[PDB]
């Protein structure tokens, strides 16, 4: 037994068949999320408000994932897993979150920042819901490599491609915190230690690292 829960923002909406056993806590989160969400506008052109039902369910996923603690089992965990499963079956037709994001970019009037926010919400939710990416993907490219239909070479850039390289690291830290946060903390600690243990390195790092 389930009851429909409507989460909406102006014209666009999504209905979620919540189990009656956890509908009480889902209605709580619905009320909290609807309070957090900004006021609807024409064309959804303003920032931090969804343009498509996919974005809106993303933001709701995002909000619930913010409250759920990874260490401590909470009441919101079951609602997270439930609305995650709904998002997957409704918008990820077996495909990857990037494939969806890329679909939205060319079809709907979604901006690049809104799209990255959607990816971050989905990926954060996946990790908070104790559902890592342990299953190997069915990516066509890597399927083709296994079968011997494709040969892959990786190339790494260097200096002089962009003047604002640091915003690329900023975007990685924002969007993929739950995937690379530990790499960036490790790399930051390694560099701090190399400055400390290298004789005159601090002289070269005038505003620190």
What is the residue-wise DSSP string for 40-73?
Answer: --GGG-STTS-SSHHHHHHHHHHHHHHHS-SSS-
Q: 105: which residues sit within 8 A by CB, 6+ positions away?
A: 112, 115
> Which of 175, 176, 172, 169 is CA-nearest to residue 191?
169
User: Could you count the other beta carbons within 10 Å of the beta carbon of residue 141?
Assistant: 10
| Percent helix, percent strand, percent coil in the chain, to nearest 5 | 55, 10, 35
The Cα-based distances of 101 to 33, 38, 115, 194, 201 in angstroms read 22, 22, 6, 39, 43
Cβ pair 109, 163 in contact under 8 A: no
Dihedral angle sign, alpha carbons of residues 188, 189, 190, 196: positive
Q: Specify the resolution in Å.
A: 1.9
The first and second tokens of residue 118, run together, are 């959607």
């Amino acid at each position: 037994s389930t009851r429909p829960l409507t989460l909406s923002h102006g014209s666009l909406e999504h209905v979620l068949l919540v189990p009656t056993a956890s509908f009480f806590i889902a209605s709580q989160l619905q009320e909290q999320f609807n309070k957090i969400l900004p006021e609807p506008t024409e064309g959804f052109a303003a920032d931090d408000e969804p343009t498509t039902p996919a974005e809106l369910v993303g933001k709701f996923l995002g909000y619930v994932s913010s409250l759920v603690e990874p260490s401590k089992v909470g009441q919101f965990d079951q609602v997270l897993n439930l609305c995650l499963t709904e998002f997957e079956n409704c918008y990820l037709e077996g495909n990857d979150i990037h494939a969806l994001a890329a679909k939205l970019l060319q079809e709907n009037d979604t901006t690049l920042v809104k799209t990255k926010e959607l990816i971050k919400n989905y990926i954060t939710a996946r990790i908070m819901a104790k559902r890592p990416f342990d299953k190997k993907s069915n990516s066509a490219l890597f399927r083709a490599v296994g079968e011997g239909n494709a040969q892959l070479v990786a190339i790494f850039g260097g200096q002089g491609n962009t003047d604002d390289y640091f915003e690329e690291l900023r975007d990685l830290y924002q969007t993929y915190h739950v995937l690379v946060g530990d790499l960036i903390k490790f790399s930051a600690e390694t560099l701090s230690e190399l400055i400390r243990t290298t004789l005159d390195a601090e002289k070269v790092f005038t505003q620190g690292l």
